[PDB]
Amino acid sequence: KVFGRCELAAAMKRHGLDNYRGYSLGNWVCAAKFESNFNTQATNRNTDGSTDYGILQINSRWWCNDGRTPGSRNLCNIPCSALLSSDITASVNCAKKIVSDGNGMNAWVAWRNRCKGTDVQAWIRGCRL
Ligand code: NA
Ligand code: NA
């Protein structure tokens, strides 16, 4: 599923991401935009053989099991394919674990390079939330 901007903001808000660990909703929508272009089915293979999955491009080296990433942890305890669902619940619950990990949203390279320090409130402007 490809989310609309406000549609995703509302789904994320409903799932408790708004100001989760201090990150306003705009941050999460901005990250999703540049990680996956709001597409829950997005996948990308990394040089190290790991793969990123779903709306927030969660990596198989640490967070989910895709059965093909040798010596990987499955810290969110879920098959990576669960992260590709039109229901973003698994992605959101796993993202909460990631962002609590100590590096905050810097764990998402696109957020750090393209959202951090920008006017992220613009990503939810106009939406009825
Ligand atoms: Na893994
Ligand atoms: Na933080």
mmCIF file of all heavy atoms in Angstrom, residues 30-70:
data_model
loop_
_atom_site.group_PDB
_atom_site.id
_atom_site.type_symbol
_atom_site.label_atom_id
_atom_site.label_comp_id
_atom_site.label_asym_id
_atom_site.label_seq_id
_atom_site.Cartn_x
_atom_site.Cartn_y
_atom_site.Cartn_z
ATOM 1 N N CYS A 30 8.276 12.442 7.765
ATOM 2 C CA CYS A 30 9.412 12.826 6.941
ATOM 3 C C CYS A 30 10.313 11.614 6.692
ATOM 4 O O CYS A 30 10.766 11.392 5.577
ATOM 5 C CB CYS A 30 10.209 13.957 7.609
ATOM 6 S SG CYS A 30 11.584 14.556 6.611
ATOM 7 N N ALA A 31 10.578 10.839 7.742
ATOM 8 C CA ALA A 31 11.441 9.667 7.613
ATOM 9 C C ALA A 31 10.825 8.658 6.658
ATOM 10 O O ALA A 31 11.513 8.115 5.805
ATOM 11 C CB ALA A 31 11.685 9.023 8.972
ATOM 12 N N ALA A 32 9.527 8.411 6.818
ATOM 13 C CA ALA A 32 8.821 7.446 5.980
ATOM 14 C C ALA A 32 8.884 7.889 4.528
ATOM 15 O O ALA A 32 9.155 7.075 3.639
ATOM 16 C CB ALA A 32 7.379 7.287 6.440
ATOM 17 N N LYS A 33 8.673 9.184 4.295
ATOM 18 C CA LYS A 33 8.757 9.750 2.939
ATOM 19 C C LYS A 33 10.075 9.416 2.248
ATOM 20 O O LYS A 33 10.101 8.919 1.127
ATOM 21 C CB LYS A 33 8.593 11.267 2.973
ATOM 22 C CG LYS A 33 8.848 11.939 1.617
ATOM 23 C CD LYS A 33 7.771 11.581 0.588
ATOM 24 C CE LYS A 33 8.076 12.177 -0.775
ATOM 25 N NZ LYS A 33 7.026 11.799 -1.768
ATOM 26 N N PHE A 34 11.182 9.669 2.925
ATOM 27 C CA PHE A 34 12.458 9.503 2.263
ATOM 28 C C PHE A 34 13.003 8.085 2.369
ATOM 29 O O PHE A 34 13.875 7.708 1.587
ATOM 30 C CB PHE A 34 13.450 10.532 2.804
ATOM 31 C CG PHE A 34 13.074 11.941 2.428
ATOM 32 C CD1 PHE A 34 12.863 12.907 3.395
ATOM 33 C CD2 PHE A 34 12.857 12.271 1.089
ATOM 34 C CE1 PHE A 34 12.486 14.202 3.035
ATOM 35 C CE2 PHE A 34 12.473 13.560 0.729
ATOM 36 C CZ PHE A 34 12.291 14.524 1.710
ATOM 37 N N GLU A 35 12.486 7.287 3.299
ATOM 38 C CA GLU A 35 12.940 5.897 3.375
ATOM 39 C C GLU A 35 12.249 5.022 2.327
ATOM 40 O O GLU A 35 12.884 4.200 1.677
ATOM 41 C CB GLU A 35 12.704 5.323 4.776
ATOM 42 C CG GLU A 35 13.614 5.894 5.877
ATOM 43 C CD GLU A 35 15.070 5.467 5.759
ATOM 44 O OE1 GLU A 35 15.391 4.594 4.924
ATOM 45 O OE2 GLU A 35 15.902 6.023 6.496
ATOM 46 N N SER A 36 10.948 5.227 2.141
ATOM 47 C CA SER A 36 10.139 4.294 1.369
ATOM 48 C C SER A 36 9.185 4.950 0.387
ATOM 49 O O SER A 36 8.508 4.243 -0.371
ATOM 50 C CB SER A 36 9.322 3.435 2.316
ATOM 51 O OG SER A 36 8.330 4.243 2.919
ATOM 52 N N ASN A 37 9.121 6.281 0.419
ATOM 53 C CA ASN A 37 8.170 7.046 -0.387
ATOM 54 C C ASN A 37 6.746 6.620 -0.037
ATOM 55 O O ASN A 37 5.882 6.536 -0.903
ATOM 56 C CB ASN A 37 8.461 6.869 -1.886
ATOM 57 C CG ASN A 37 7.933 8.009 -2.730
ATOM 58 O OD1 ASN A 37 7.683 9.107 -2.236
ATOM 59 N ND2 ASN A 37 7.765 7.754 -4.026
ATOM 60 N N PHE A 38 6.534 6.347 1.253
ATOM 61 C CA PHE A 38 5.234 5.972 1.824
ATOM 62 C C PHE A 38 4.712 4.606 1.340
ATOM 63 O O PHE A 38 3.532 4.324 1.481
ATOM 64 C CB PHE A 38 4.176 7.037 1.525
ATOM 65 C CG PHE A 38 4.459 8.386 2.131
ATOM 66 C CD1 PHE A 38 4.056 9.544 1.482
ATOM 67 C CD2 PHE A 38 5.109 8.500 3.338
ATOM 68 C CE1 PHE A 38 4.289 10.799 2.037
ATOM 69 C CE2 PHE A 38 5.345 9.752 3.902
ATOM 70 C CZ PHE A 38 4.934 10.897 3.243
ATOM 71 N N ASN A 39 5.590 3.775 0.781
ATOM 72 C CA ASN A 39 5.207 2.469 0.210
ATOM 73 C C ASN A 39 5.532 1.369 1.200
ATOM 74 O O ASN A 39 6.705 1.165 1.515
ATOM 75 C CB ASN A 39 5.950 2.244 -1.117
ATOM 76 C CG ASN A 39 5.574 0.941 -1.813
ATOM 77 O OD1 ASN A 39 4.719 0.190 -1.356
ATOM 78 N ND2 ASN A 39 6.188 0.701 -2.966
ATOM 79 N N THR A 40 4.517 0.673 1.714
ATOM 80 C CA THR A 40 4.778 -0.367 2.701
ATOM 81 C C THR A 40 5.558 -1.544 2.108
ATOM 82 O O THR A 40 6.124 -2.335 2.848
ATOM 83 C CB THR A 40 3.484 -0.933 3.322
ATOM 84 O OG1 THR A 40 2.715 -1.575 2.295
ATOM 85 C CG2 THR A 40 2.653 0.175 4.012
ATOM 86 N N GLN A 41 5.582 -1.672 0.783
ATOM 87 C CA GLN A 41 6.212 -2.849 0.160
ATOM 88 C C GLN A 41 7.659 -2.598 -0.255
ATOM 89 O O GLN A 41 8.297 -3.450 -0.880
ATOM 90 C CB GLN A 41 5.410 -3.297 -1.056
ATOM 91 C CG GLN A 41 4.009 -3.752 -0.722
ATOM 92 C CD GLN A 41 3.345 -4.413 -1.908
ATOM 93 O OE1 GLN A 41 2.531 -3.804 -2.615
ATOM 94 N NE2 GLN A 41 3.723 -5.652 -2.161
ATOM 95 N N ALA A 42 8.176 -1.424 0.081
ATOM 96 C CA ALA A 42 9.544 -1.092 -0.286
ATOM 97 C C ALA A 42 10.556 -2.049 0.380
ATOM 98 O O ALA A 42 10.471 -2.348 1.574
ATOM 99 C CB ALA A 42 9.851 0.339 0.078
ATOM 100 N N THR A 43 11.481 -2.554 -0.427
ATOM 101 C CA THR A 43 12.629 -3.309 0.065
ATOM 102 C C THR A 43 13.871 -2.786 -0.636
ATOM 103 O O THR A 43 13.800 -2.338 -1.786
ATOM 104 C CB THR A 43 12.509 -4.818 -0.197
ATOM 105 O OG1 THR A 43 12.360 -5.043 -1.604
ATOM 106 C CG2 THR A 43 11.316 -5.419 0.530
ATOM 107 N N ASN A 44 15.004 -2.836 0.059
ATOM 108 C CA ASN A 44 16.295 -2.467 -0.523
ATOM 109 C C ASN A 44 17.395 -3.309 0.093
ATOM 110 O O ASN A 44 17.454 -3.444 1.310
ATOM 111 C CB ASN A 44 16.590 -0.981 -0.310
ATOM 112 C CG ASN A 44 15.772 -0.090 -1.228
ATOM 113 O OD1 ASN A 44 16.116 0.093 -2.396
ATOM 114 N ND2 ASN A 44 14.688 0.474 -0.703
ATOM 115 N N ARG A 45 18.242 -3.892 -0.752
ATOM 116 C CA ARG A 45 19.353 -4.735 -0.307
ATOM 117 C C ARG A 45 20.561 -3.878 0.001
ATOM 118 O O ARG A 45 20.867 -2.967 -0.756
ATOM 119 C CB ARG A 45 19.689 -5.796 -1.377
ATOM 120 C CG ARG A 45 19.494 -7.229 -0.921
ATOM 121 C CD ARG A 45 20.718 -7.668 -0.162
ATOM 122 N NE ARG A 45 20.637 -9.015 0.417
ATOM 123 C CZ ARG A 45 20.809 -10.163 -0.234
ATOM 124 N NH1 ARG A 45 21.046 -10.171 -1.537
ATOM 125 N NH2 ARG A 45 20.724 -11.312 0.429
ATOM 126 N N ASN A 46 21.238 -4.169 1.109
ATOM 127 C CA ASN A 46 22.448 -3.441 1.481
ATOM 128 C C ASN A 46 23.692 -4.200 1.064
ATOM 129 O O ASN A 46 23.631 -5.393 0.784
ATOM 130 C CB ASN A 46 22.492 -3.188 2.987
ATOM 131 C CG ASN A 46 21.268 -2.461 3.493
ATOM 132 O OD1 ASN A 46 20.551 -2.951 4.364
ATOM 133 N ND2 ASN A 46 21.023 -1.287 2.953
ATOM 134 N N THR A 47 24.826 -3.506 1.049
ATOM 135 C CA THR A 47 26.089 -4.105 0.634
ATOM 136 C C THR A 47 26.461 -5.302 1.506
ATOM 137 O O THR A 47 26.992 -6.291 1.012
ATOM 138 C CB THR A 47 27.234 -3.073 0.680
ATOM 139 O OG1 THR A 47 27.194 -2.372 1.930
ATOM 140 C CG2 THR A 47 27.090 -2.070 -0.449
ATOM 141 N N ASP A 48 26.149 -5.225 2.798
ATOM 142 C CA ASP A 48 26.525 -6.288 3.727
ATOM 143 C C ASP A 48 25.646 -7.543 3.613
ATOM 144 O O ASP A 48 25.816 -8.484 4.380
ATOM 145 C CB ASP A 48 26.522 -5.753 5.168
ATOM 146 C CG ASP A 48 25.124 -5.434 5.696
ATOM 147 O OD1 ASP A 48 24.155 -5.357 4.913
ATOM 148 O OD2 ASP A 48 24.998 -5.235 6.918
ATOM 149 N N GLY A 49 24.730 -7.571 2.646
ATOM 150 C CA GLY A 49 23.847 -8.715 2.481
ATOM 151 C C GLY A 49 22.535 -8.616 3.256
ATOM 152 O O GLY A 49 21.627 -9.426 3.075
ATOM 153 N N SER A 50 22.419 -7.620 4.126
ATOM 154 C CA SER A 50 21.167 -7.427 4.840
ATOM 155 C C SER A 50 20.158 -6.713 3.923
ATOM 156 O O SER A 50 20.519 -6.218 2.863
ATOM 157 C CB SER A 50 21.402 -6.638 6.123
ATOM 158 O OG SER A 50 21.870 -5.337 5.817
ATOM 159 N N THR A 51 18.898 -6.667 4.331
ATOM 160 C CA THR A 51 17.863 -6.014 3.529
ATOM 161 C C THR A 51 17.011 -5.137 4.430
ATOM 162 O O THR A 51 16.789 -5.483 5.598
ATOM 163 C CB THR A 51 16.987 -7.051 2.817
ATOM 164 O OG1 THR A 51 17.820 -7.882 2.005
ATOM 165 C CG2 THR A 51 15.946 -6.393 1.941
ATOM 166 N N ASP A 52 16.569 -3.993 3.897
ATOM 167 C CA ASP A 52 15.670 -3.073 4.594
ATOM 168 C C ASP A 52 14.230 -3.260 4.129
ATOM 169 O O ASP A 52 13.979 -3.382 2.936
ATOM 170 C CB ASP A 52 16.080 -1.627 4.360
ATOM 171 C CG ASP A 52 17.473 -1.332 4.841
ATOM 172 O OD1 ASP A 52 17.886 -1.879 5.880
ATOM 173 O OD2 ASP A 52 18.152 -0.526 4.190
ATOM 174 N N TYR A 53 13.290 -3.236 5.069
ATOM 175 C CA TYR A 53 11.915 -3.616 4.776
ATOM 176 C C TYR A 53 10.876 -2.591 5.196
ATOM 177 O O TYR A 53 10.856 -2.127 6.330
ATOM 178 C CB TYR A 53 11.576 -4.940 5.472
ATOM 179 C CG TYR A 53 12.349 -6.112 4.944
ATOM 180 C CD1 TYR A 53 13.621 -6.396 5.426
ATOM 181 C CD2 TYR A 53 11.812 -6.939 3.964
ATOM 182 C CE1 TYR A 53 14.348 -7.473 4.939
ATOM 183 C CE2 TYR A 53 12.533 -8.019 3.468
ATOM 184 C CZ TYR A 53 13.794 -8.279 3.962
ATOM 185 O OH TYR A 53 14.522 -9.343 3.489
ATOM 186 N N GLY A 54 9.986 -2.268 4.274
ATOM 187 C CA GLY A 54 8.770 -1.594 4.647
ATOM 188 C C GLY A 54 8.875 -0.095 4.724
ATOM 189 O O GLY A 54 9.863 0.507 4.301
ATOM 190 N N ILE A 55 7.826 0.485 5.289
ATOM 191 C CA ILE A 55 7.606 1.913 5.323
ATOM 192 C C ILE A 55 8.765 2.662 5.996
ATOM 193 O O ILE A 55 9.111 3.776 5.599
ATOM 194 C CB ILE A 55 6.255 2.205 6.036
ATOM 195 C CG1 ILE A 55 5.805 3.640 5.791
ATOM 196 C CG2 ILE A 55 6.284 1.813 7.529
ATOM 197 C CD1 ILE A 55 4.789 3.718 4.704
ATOM 198 N N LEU A 56 9.384 2.033 6.986
ATOM 199 C CA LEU A 56 10.474 2.674 7.709
ATOM 200 C C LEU A 56 11.807 1.971 7.457
ATOM 201 O O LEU A 56 12.792 2.258 8.123
ATOM 202 C CB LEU A 56 10.165 2.723 9.202
ATOM 203 C CG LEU A 56 9.113 3.780 9.579
ATOM 204 C CD1 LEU A 56 8.758 3.706 11.058
ATOM 205 C CD2 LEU A 56 9.626 5.159 9.240
ATOM 206 N N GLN A 57 11.828 1.074 6.469
ATOM 207 C CA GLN A 57 13.063 0.453 5.994
ATOM 208 C C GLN A 57 13.905 -0.149 7.129
ATOM 209 O O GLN A 57 15.095 0.138 7.288
ATOM 210 C CB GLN A 57 13.878 1.476 5.205
ATOM 211 C CG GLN A 57 13.287 1.773 3.832
ATOM 212 C CD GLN A 57 13.342 0.582 2.913
ATOM 213 O OE1 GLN A 57 14.342 0.374 2.230
ATOM 214 N NE2 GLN A 57 12.275 -0.214 2.892
ATOM 215 N N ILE A 58 13.261 -0.997 7.904
ATOM 216 C CA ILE A 58 13.876 -1.621 9.054
ATOM 217 C C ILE A 58 14.778 -2.767 8.600
ATOM 218 O O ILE A 58 14.389 -3.583 7.768
ATOM 219 C CB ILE A 58 12.796 -2.101 10.009
ATOM 220 C CG1 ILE A 58 12.089 -0.882 10.613
ATOM 221 C CG2 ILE A 58 13.375 -3.000 11.079
ATOM 222 C CD1 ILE A 58 10.894 -1.249 11.448
ATOM 223 N N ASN A 59 15.980 -2.813 9.163
ATOM 224 C CA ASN A 59 17.055 -3.646 8.644
ATOM 225 C C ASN A 59 17.087 -5.068 9.226
ATOM 226 O O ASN A 59 16.890 -5.258 10.429
ATOM 227 C CB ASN A 59 18.384 -2.939 8.903
ATOM 228 C CG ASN A 59 19.528 -3.630 8.247
ATOM 229 O OD1 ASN A 59 20.311 -4.283 8.913
ATOM 230 N ND2 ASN A 59 19.626 -3.518 6.932
ATOM 231 N N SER A 60 17.368 -6.057 8.374
ATOM 232 C CA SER A 60 17.350 -7.467 8.782
ATOM 233 C C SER A 60 18.579 -7.898 9.578
ATOM 234 O O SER A 60 18.577 -8.970 10.177
ATOM 235 C CB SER A 60 17.206 -8.380 7.550
ATOM 236 O OG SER A 60 18.375 -8.341 6.751
ATOM 237 N N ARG A 61 19.627 -7.087 9.570
ATOM 238 C CA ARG A 61 20.832 -7.405 10.348
ATOM 239 C C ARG A 61 20.507 -7.404 11.842
ATOM 240 O O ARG A 61 20.997 -8.245 12.589
ATOM 241 C CB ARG A 61 21.969 -6.417 10.013
ATOM 242 C CG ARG A 61 23.234 -6.462 10.882
ATOM 243 C CD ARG A 61 24.203 -7.545 10.441
ATOM 244 N NE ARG A 61 24.464 -7.509 9.002
ATOM 245 C CZ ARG A 61 24.893 -8.561 8.308
ATOM 246 N NH1 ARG A 61 25.098 -9.718 8.930
ATOM 247 N NH2 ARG A 61 25.103 -8.469 6.998
ATOM 248 N N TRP A 62 19.624 -6.510 12.274
ATOM 249 C CA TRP A 62 19.342 -6.385 13.698
ATOM 250 C C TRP A 62 17.920 -6.687 14.120
ATOM 251 O O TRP A 62 17.703 -7.212 15.207
ATOM 252 C CB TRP A 62 19.693 -4.970 14.173
ATOM 253 C CG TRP A 62 21.143 -4.685 14.049
ATOM 254 C CD1 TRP A 62 21.755 -3.945 13.086
ATOM 255 C CD2 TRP A 62 22.179 -5.172 14.905
ATOM 256 N NE1 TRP A 62 23.113 -3.927 13.298
ATOM 257 C CE2 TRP A 62 23.397 -4.673 14.411
ATOM 258 C CE3 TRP A 62 22.191 -5.975 16.050
ATOM 259 C CZ2 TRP A 62 24.620 -4.952 15.023
ATOM 260 C CZ3 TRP A 62 23.399 -6.249 16.658
ATOM 261 C CH2 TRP A 62 24.598 -5.738 16.143
ATOM 262 N N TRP A 63 16.944 -6.344 13.285
ATOM 263 C CA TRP A 63 15.597 -6.134 13.813
ATOM 264 C C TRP A 63 14.566 -7.174 13.431
ATOM 265 O O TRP A 63 13.595 -7.358 14.145
ATOM 266 C CB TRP A 63 15.101 -4.742 13.392
ATOM 267 C CG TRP A 63 16.047 -3.686 13.837
ATOM 268 C CD1 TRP A 63 16.924 -2.986 13.067
ATOM 269 C CD2 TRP A 63 16.260 -3.263 15.179
ATOM 270 N NE1 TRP A 63 17.656 -2.128 13.848
ATOM 271 C CE2 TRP A 63 17.270 -2.282 15.152
ATOM 272 C CE3 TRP A 63 15.675 -3.604 16.410
ATOM 273 C CZ2 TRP A 63 17.716 -1.634 16.305
ATOM 274 C CZ3 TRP A 63 16.122 -2.962 17.556
ATOM 275 C CH2 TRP A 63 17.135 -1.987 17.491
ATOM 276 N N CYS A 64 14.770 -7.853 12.312
ATOM 277 C CA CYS A 64 13.793 -8.840 11.856
ATOM 278 C C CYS A 64 14.498 -10.000 11.168
ATOM 279 O O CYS A 64 15.643 -9.865 10.750
ATOM 280 C CB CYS A 64 12.771 -8.190 10.908
ATOM 281 S SG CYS A 64 13.453 -7.548 9.335
ATOM 282 N N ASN A 65 13.811 -11.131 11.042
ATOM 283 C CA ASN A 65 14.392 -12.294 10.396
ATOM 284 C C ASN A 65 13.878 -12.474 8.965
ATOM 285 O O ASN A 65 12.678 -12.594 8.751
ATOM 286 C CB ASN A 65 14.092 -13.560 11.206
ATOM 287 C CG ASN A 65 14.736 -14.802 10.598
ATOM 288 O OD1 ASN A 65 15.912 -14.793 10.261
ATOM 289 N ND2 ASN A 65 13.948 -15.854 10.412
ATOM 290 N N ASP A 66 14.777 -12.488 7.988
ATOM 291 C CA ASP A 66 14.348 -12.760 6.619
ATOM 292 C C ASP A 66 14.939 -14.075 6.125
ATOM 293 O O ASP A 66 14.799 -14.430 4.956
ATOM 294 C CB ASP A 66 14.701 -11.597 5.672
ATOM 295 C CG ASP A 66 16.196 -11.310 5.580
ATOM 296 O OD1 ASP A 66 17.008 -12.032 6.186
ATOM 297 O OD2 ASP A 66 16.563 -10.332 4.881
ATOM 298 N N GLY A 67 15.604 -14.786 7.025
ATOM 299 C CA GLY A 67 16.081 -16.122 6.729
ATOM 300 C C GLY A 67 17.269 -16.140 5.797
ATOM 301 O O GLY A 67 17.690 -17.194 5.345
ATOM 302 N N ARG A 68 17.830 -14.976 5.505
ATOM 303 C CA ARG A 68 18.956 -14.938 4.587
ATOM 304 C C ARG A 68 20.020 -13.919 5.004
ATOM 305 O O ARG A 68 20.853 -13.509 4.201
ATOM 306 C CB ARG A 68 18.453 -14.660 3.167
ATOM 307 C CG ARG A 68 18.139 -13.200 2.883
ATOM 308 C CD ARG A 68 17.914 -12.950 1.394
ATOM 309 N NE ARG A 68 17.724 -11.527 1.120
ATOM 310 C CZ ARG A 68 17.347 -11.025 -0.056
ATOM 311 N NH1 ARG A 68 17.107 -11.841 -1.078
ATOM 312 N NH2 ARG A 68 17.201 -9.704 -0.207
ATOM 313 N N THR A 69 20.000 -13.527 6.272
ATOM 314 C CA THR A 69 20.996 -12.592 6.768
ATOM 315 C C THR A 69 21.801 -13.296 7.857
ATOM 316 O O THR A 69 21.433 -13.271 9.027
ATOM 317 C CB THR A 69 20.356 -11.278 7.310
ATOM 318 O OG1 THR A 69 19.428 -10.751 6.344
ATOM 319 C CG2 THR A 69 21.433 -10.225 7.585
ATOM 320 N N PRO A 70 22.888 -13.965 7.460
ATOM 321 C CA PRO A 70 23.698 -14.771 8.384
ATOM 322 C C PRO A 70 24.157 -14.010 9.622
ATOM 323 O O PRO A 70 24.695 -12.904 9.525
ATOM 324 C CB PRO A 70 24.900 -15.178 7.522
ATOM 325 C CG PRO A 70 24.346 -15.229 6.140
ATOM 326 C CD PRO A 70 23.346 -14.104 6.067
#
